[PDB]
Design an enzyme around this catalytic site. Structure first.
Site, PDB file in Angstrom:
ATOM      1  N   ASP A   1       0.807  -1.233   0.000  1.00 48.41           N
ATOM      2  CA  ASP A   1       0.000   0.000   0.000  1.00 48.41           C
ATOM      3  C   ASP A   1       0.841   1.285   0.000  1.00 48.41           C
ATOM      4  O   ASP A   1       1.285   1.768   1.035  1.00 48.41           O
ATOM      5  CB  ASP A   1      -0.871  -0.041   1.234  1.00 48.41           C
ATOM      6  CG  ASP A   1      -1.907   1.040   1.263  1.00 48.41           C
ATOM      7  OD1 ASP A   1      -1.849   1.922   0.352  1.00 48.41           O
ATOM      8  OD2 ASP A   1      -2.772   1.032   2.145  1.00 48.41           O
ATOM      9  N   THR A   2       1.020   1.849  -1.195  1.00 49.90           N
ATOM     10  CA  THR A   2       1.799   3.032  -1.326  1.00 49.90           C
ATOM     11  C   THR A   2       1.144   4.254  -0.697  1.00 49.90           C
ATOM     12  O   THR A   2       1.834   5.258  -0.448  1.00 49.90           O
ATOM     13  CB  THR A   2       2.069   3.337  -2.815  1.00 49.90           C
ATOM     14  OG1 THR A   2       0.837   3.512  -3.524  1.00 49.90           O
ATOM     15  CG2 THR A   2       2.856   2.216  -3.444  1.00 49.90           C
ATOM     16  N   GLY A   3      -0.143   4.210  -0.402  1.00 52.24           N
ATOM     17  CA  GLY A   3      -0.871   5.294   0.234  1.00 52.24           C
ATOM     18  C   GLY A   3      -0.760   5.234   1.734  1.00 52.24           C
ATOM     19  O   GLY A   3      -1.304   6.164   2.387  1.00 52.24           O
TER      20      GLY A   3
HETATM   21  C1  LIG Z   1       0.004   6.305   9.369  1.00 50.52           C
HETATM   22  O1  LIG Z   1      -0.016   5.043   8.739  1.00 50.52           O
HETATM   23  C2  LIG Z   1      -1.206   4.789   8.122  1.00 50.52           C
HETATM   24  C3  LIG Z   1      -2.289   5.666   8.185  1.00 50.52           C
HETATM   25  C4  LIG Z   1      -3.419   5.369   7.426  1.00 50.52           C
HETATM   26  C5  LIG Z   1      -3.540   4.208   6.688  1.00 50.52           C
HETATM   27  S1  LIG Z   1      -4.993   3.931   5.735  1.00 50.52           S
HETATM   28  O2  LIG Z   1      -5.205   2.453   5.697  1.00 50.52           O
HETATM   29  O3  LIG Z   1      -6.070   4.765   6.319  1.00 50.52           O
HETATM   30  N1  LIG Z   1      -4.785   4.472   4.193  1.00 50.52           N
HETATM   31  C6  LIG Z   1      -4.402   5.872   4.104  1.00 50.52           C
HETATM   32  C7  LIG Z   1      -5.018   6.635   2.934  1.00 50.52           C
HETATM   33  C8  LIG Z   1      -6.543   6.678   2.916  1.00 50.52           C
HETATM   34  C9  LIG Z   1      -4.490   8.083   2.959  1.00 50.52           C
HETATM   35  C10 LIG Z   1      -4.125   3.580   3.244  1.00 50.52           C
HETATM   36  C11 LIG Z   1      -5.071   3.176   2.125  1.00 50.52           C
HETATM   37  O4  LIG Z   1      -4.348   2.504   1.092  1.00 50.52           O
HETATM   38  C12 LIG Z   1      -6.273   2.349   2.571  1.00 50.52           C
HETATM   39  C13 LIG Z   1      -5.886   0.941   2.979  1.00 50.52           C
HETATM   40  C14 LIG Z   1      -7.119   0.151   3.463  1.00 50.52           C
HETATM   41  C15 LIG Z   1      -7.660  -0.846   2.664  1.00 50.52           C
HETATM   42  C16 LIG Z   1      -8.789  -1.575   3.046  1.00 50.52           C
HETATM   43  C17 LIG Z   1      -9.331  -1.313   4.302  1.00 50.52           C
HETATM   44  C18 LIG Z   1      -8.813  -0.289   5.083  1.00 50.52           C
HETATM   45  C19 LIG Z   1      -7.693   0.440   4.682  1.00 50.52           C
HETATM   46  N2  LIG Z   1      -7.251   2.220   1.498  1.00 50.52           N
HETATM   47  C20 LIG Z   1      -8.473   2.746   1.469  1.00 50.52           C
HETATM   48  O5  LIG Z   1      -8.896   3.432   2.419  1.00 50.52           O
HETATM   49  O6  LIG Z   1      -9.144   2.481   0.316  1.00 50.52           O
HETATM   50  C21 LIG Z   1     -10.494   2.932   0.297  1.00 50.52           C
HETATM   51  C22 LIG Z   1     -10.732   3.581  -1.056  1.00 50.52           C
HETATM   52  O7  LIG Z   1     -10.934   2.504  -1.983  1.00 50.52           O
HETATM   53  C23 LIG Z   1     -11.361   1.369  -1.272  1.00 50.52           C
HETATM   54  O8  LIG Z   1     -10.364   0.337  -1.397  1.00 50.52           O
HETATM   55  C24 LIG Z   1      -9.998  -0.193  -0.150  1.00 50.52           C
HETATM   56  O9  LIG Z   1     -10.351  -1.602  -0.149  1.00 50.52           O
HETATM   57  C25 LIG Z   1     -11.791  -1.589   0.043  1.00 50.52           C
HETATM   58  C26 LIG Z   1     -11.944  -0.583   1.188  1.00 50.52           C
HETATM   59  C27 LIG Z   1     -10.886   0.473   0.900  1.00 50.52           C
HETATM   60  C28 LIG Z   1     -11.432   1.707   0.206  1.00 50.52           C
HETATM   61  C29 LIG Z   1      -2.520   3.263   6.773  1.00 50.52           C
HETATM   62  C30 LIG Z   1      -1.348   3.575   7.452  1.00 50.52           C
END
Ligand SMILES: COc1ccc(S(=O)(=O)N(CC(C)C)C[C@@H](O)[C@H](Cc2ccccc2)NC(=O)O[C@H]2CO[C@H]3O[C@@H]4OCC[C@@H]4[C@H]32)cc1
Ligand SMILES: [Cl-]
Ligand SMILES: [Cl-]
Ligand SMILES: [Cl-]
Ligand SMILES: [Cl-]
Ligand SMILES: [Cl-]
Ligand SMILES: [Cl-]
Ligand code: NA
Ligand code: NA
EC number: 3.4.23.16
Lengths: 99, 99
Positions: free
Chosen positions: B25-27
């Site tokens: 997860d690059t985000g």
């Molecule tokens: C400080 O360190 C951190 C702080 C925050 C995070 S995070 O998980 O909140 N996130 C940060 C980002 C929103 C700025 C990383 C993301 O990659 C998350 C990672 C994530 C994935 C799944 C579940 C929770 C989090 N993905 C996410 O929220 O995706 C949303 C949008 O699209 C959908 O796809 C995903 O899959 C379906 C649900 C999500 C929905 C991780 C480490």
């Protein structure tokens, strides 16, 4: 280009004639953009992340430039904390992860 | 490898002697793993996402094997809905985004 991950992978996007910064996010299925106006009709969607779920507005077939590459696809608008470019549009710009 | 993004970039990890699946997860700035025990000291932290913040335990100097590549760093443990490998460990395996 090649982007390393020592810093956040922020790029400039252009949507609705406006430049914004957005995160390239391989962990996001979906592109999600902070509150703004977009043309056309929208559909409801709930998306879920680390803290829980939020309601967003789903706009389809929206033109968006990402790091100089042109994409046309679905953009979710709502109370996301940061603009995130998800896999639906990363695939349109040809992005891959490599190690 | 080269990982395309048509599907979620899931890989096998080994942490705390346990095999798990996690998203590359690059985000994510940080690596966040679902509730489990890890050895040594920890301290409390709050981390935000979409949907708000969760409370996690911060463990430093933890070794995780990521798709057969060994890396050490801080791992956050808490009620994340998915195991996330964030930039702090992606850098250590030489991961880049390419387009
Ligand atoms: C400080 O360190 C951190 C702080 C925050 C995070 S995070 O998980 O909140 N996130 C940060 C980002 C929103 C700025 C990383 C993301 O990659 C998350 C990672 C994530 C994935 C799944 C579940 C929770 C989090 N993905 C996410 O929220 O995706 C949303 C949008 O699209 C959908 O796809 C995903 O899959 C379906 C649900 C999500 C929905 C991780 C480490
Ligand atoms: Cl799309
Ligand atoms: Cl798992
Ligand atoms: Cl455990
Ligand atoms: Cl945070
Ligand atoms: Cl670290
Ligand atoms: Cl490097
Ligand atoms: Na539309
Ligand atoms: Na430790």
């Amino acid at each position: 280009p090649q982007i390393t991950l020592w810093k956040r992978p922020l790029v400039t996007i252009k949507i609705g004639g406006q430049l914004k910064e957005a995160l390239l996010d391989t962990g996001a299925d979906d592109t999600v953009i902070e509150e703004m106006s977009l043309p056309g009709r929208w559909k409801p969607k709930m998306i879920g992340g680390i803290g829980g779920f939020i309601k967003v507005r789903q706009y389809d077939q929206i033109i968006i430039e990402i790091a100089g590459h042109k994409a046309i696809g679905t953009v979710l608008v709502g109370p996301t904390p940061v603009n995130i470019i998800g896999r639906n549009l990363l695939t349109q710009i040809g992005a891959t992860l490599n190690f």
